[PDB]
Nucleic acid binder design. Structure first.
Ligand SMILES: [K+]
Ligand SMILES: [K+]
Ligand SMILES: [K+]
Ligand SMILES: [Mg+2]
Ligand SMILES: [Mg+2]
Ligand SMILES: [Mg+2]
Ligand SMILES: [Mg+2]
Ligand SMILES: [Mg+2]
Ligand SMILES: [Mg+2]
Ligand SMILES: [Mg+2]
Ligand SMILES: [Mg+2]
Ligand SMILES: [Mg+2]
Ligand SMILES: [Mg+2]
Ligand SMILES: [Mg+2]
Ligand SMILES: [Mg+2]
Ligand SMILES: [Mg+2]
Ligand SMILES: [Mg+2]
Lengths: 51, 84, 177, 136
RNA sequence: UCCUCCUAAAGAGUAACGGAGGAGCACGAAGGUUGGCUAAUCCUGGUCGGACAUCAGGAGGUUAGUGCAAUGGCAUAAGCCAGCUUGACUGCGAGCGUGACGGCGCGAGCAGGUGCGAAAGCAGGUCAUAGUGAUCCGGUGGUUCUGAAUGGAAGGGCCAUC
RNA sequence: CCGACUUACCAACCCGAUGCAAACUGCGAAUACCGGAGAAUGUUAUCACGGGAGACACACGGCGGGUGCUAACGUCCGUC
């Protein structure tokens, strides 16, 4: 369905990322969340990026 | 005469059986973590030393003997563990 | 409030002697007055719901609560959660002030007013009455009204029966027919 | 002809017909016809027996039909093999156990009531007996 | 292929071209937490308003609701509303359930770092049960591994994901 | 307009009596199953690991059932 996969990339300099599914049409603005980054071992802002 | 074709059934589906039900009965000794009941909904409720999982599975949080009991105004069935 | 003291000093004591209540707490009391505009046409243009809300504000002196559809009704093309009306509930001082305005200046302005129906009671001492057009309230500037719109008044009381409720209101010279 | 106006399900298991009846007592009329055998009554048989007794009393008095045919019976057409699903519904039956009161009557002489039920019983497959309303 | 009920004989399991219905998802809120709240339907009285809209009162007592089938649950609500948030966390895991196996499921408690709450505490997605596809091959990012004389590199491994 | 009479008819809710249900339950056995203690009896009859298999066309009879016509030396399950 229109629910489409995206990844969230750590705003730290690490490469670490999460993956998630987003409804591209109804919510066009970028998803942004604080999540744990196990490379720096801190909660950090993550931002939507292409899978 | 002519042999005449039959029709077809529209039914014919079922799901796999899930092995629900009581796994340890009254007086039975259990270790912590032991599953006591697999449920759909809280047909039994968690008493003392008993936990309830995300799927309403009841499990031992202490070692002891399983005690079934009826409690409260609603006459609901509670499972508890008594220390040995 | 002026009519509140009239209640304390006359209505309560005459009612005591009329029904022979044993305790002053047994005498009926007005609990709240509620204004309702069932706008309805808010299904079309939301400015109509707004304009109707402004009228209740001017009449009552407080911001109305907009009321949403309890359930969808295809008979009126309303979905659940659509705004259908607005309400105001008056209590305490501002209730008595509105009640005074209503009797003393508002209902006299009703067209061909012969008095209110004495039978408009629910059976438990609450009185409810409609008004056909907003102009009975001088706070509405006749020069600026957009559309005709009425509203419902409801008076809720501690009365146990309509005979007690009617006696309470009549004691204010509430203009029954 | 008696059928449920509607039912929750269309087809039903065969089941079994063990046991003895509830409803062993005359309850509305003074006289009745009691089942002594065991078996099925079809809606057609119930109606045929009904018509027989009403003719005998020339519509006088009143008649209560105590049984109702609520069980659907399926059959397959001819020249079809086994399988391919359950057959189509053909007719409705009531399961009768010994002791069930099938019909009741009052408003007529007993000597006429016996004659009316004798004519009706000749249509029913099960054996039946004439019974009277007891005190207690 | 998967889920729910009956058949199924009061533990589990149990066939048939037996009887009945659904899935091949949705949601950054429809998740977390703190605080609060309680339904359907019907009868009375009220502007337009009608069998059915919003309002007040009463009866009733869950006959309502649950994002989507059915069953089992739910008032301490799992139903309804609002504030603040990202625990829809990373590494593990005593001990169990269910499979011939591959596998699937439940889980207290540890370490790090968070959210709500005065605090006790709660949070490792959603009332639970469907919303799915092994291996091979190949792509993308990272990495304290390997690097065919030696120093690199290619290619491979490991980790995340397609 | 409102509305009255009458019925060759039907008539929900509620109340009293009477039945039916695999996919109804405010009730509810006998058995079977799980755990614990005790005596006797039993060639360890139990479990784990390892070597070698064969078998995966079943049949009838009793009891409980689906399908069929409570037909079949019919068909598909449970248990002996
Ligand atoms: K079963
Ligand atoms: K919330
Ligand atoms: K062996
Ligand atoms: Mg031939
Ligand atoms: Mg199942
Ligand atoms: Mg079973
Ligand atoms: Mg059994
Ligand atoms: Mg709460
Ligand atoms: Mg339910
Ligand atoms: Mg759900
Ligand atoms: Mg080299
Ligand atoms: Mg084979
Ligand atoms: Mg063969
Ligand atoms: Mg075989
Ligand atoms: Mg066999
Ligand atoms: Mg055979
Ligand atoms: Mg058979």
């Amino acid at each position: 369905g229109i629910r489409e996969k995206i990844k969230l990339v750590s705003s730290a300099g690490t490469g670490h990322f999460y993956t998630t599914t987003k409804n591209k049409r109804t919510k066009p603005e970028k998803l942004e969340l604080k999540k744990f980054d196990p490379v720096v071992r801190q909660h950090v802002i993550y931002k939507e990026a292409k899978i | 005469a002519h042999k005449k074709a039959g029709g077809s059934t529209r039914n014919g589906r079922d799901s796999e059986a899930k092995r629900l039900g009581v796994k340890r009965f009254g007086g039975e000794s259990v270790l912590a973590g032991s599953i006591i009941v697999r449920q759909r909904g809280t047909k039994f409720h968690a008493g003392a030393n008993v936990g309830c999982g995300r799927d309403h599975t009841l499990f031992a949080k202490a070692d002891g003997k399983v005690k079934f009991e009826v409690k409260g105004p609603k006459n609901r069935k509670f499972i508890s563990i008594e220390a040995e | 409030a002026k009519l509140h003291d009239y209640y304390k000093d006359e209505v309560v004591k005459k009612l005591m002697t009329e029904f022979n209540y044993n305790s002053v707490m047994q005498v009926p009391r007005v609990e709240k007055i509620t204004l309702n505009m069932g706008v309805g046409e808010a299904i079309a243009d939301k400015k109509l719901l707004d304009n109707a809300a402004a009228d209740l504000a001017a009449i009552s002196g407080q911001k109305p609560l907009i009321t949403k559809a309890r359930k969808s009704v295809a008979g009126f093309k309303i979905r659940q959660g659509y705004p259908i009306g607005c309400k105001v509930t008056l209590r305490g001082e501002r209730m008595w002030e509105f009640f005074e305005r209503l009797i003393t200046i508002a209902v006299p302005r009703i067209r061909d007013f012969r008095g209110l129906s004495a039978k408009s009671f629910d059976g438990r001492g609450n009185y409810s009455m409609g008004v056909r057009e907003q102009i009975i309230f001088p706070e509405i500037d006749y020069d600026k009204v957009d559309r005709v719109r009425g509203l419902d008044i409801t008076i809720t009381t501690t009365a146990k029966s309509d005979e007690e409720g009617r006696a309470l209101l009549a004691a204010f010279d509430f203009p029954f027919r | 002809m008696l059928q449920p106006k509607r039912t929750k399900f269309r087809k039903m298991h065969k089941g079994r017909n063990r046991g003895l009846a509830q409803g062993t007592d005359v309850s509305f009329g003074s006289f009745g016809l009691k089942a002594v055998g065991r078996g099925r009554l079809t809606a057609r048989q119930i109606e045929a027996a009904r018509r027989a007794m009403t003719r005998a009393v020339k519509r006088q008095g009143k008649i209560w039909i105590r049984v109702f045919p609520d069980k659907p019976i399926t059959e397959k057409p001819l020249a079809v093999r086994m399988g391919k699903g359950k057959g189509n519904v053909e007719y409705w039956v009531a399961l009768i156990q010994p002791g069930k009161v099938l019909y009741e009557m009052d408003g007529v002489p007993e000597e006429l009531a016996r004659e009316a039920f004798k004519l009706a019983a000749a249509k029913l497959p099960i054996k039946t007996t004439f019974v009277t309303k007891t005190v207690m």
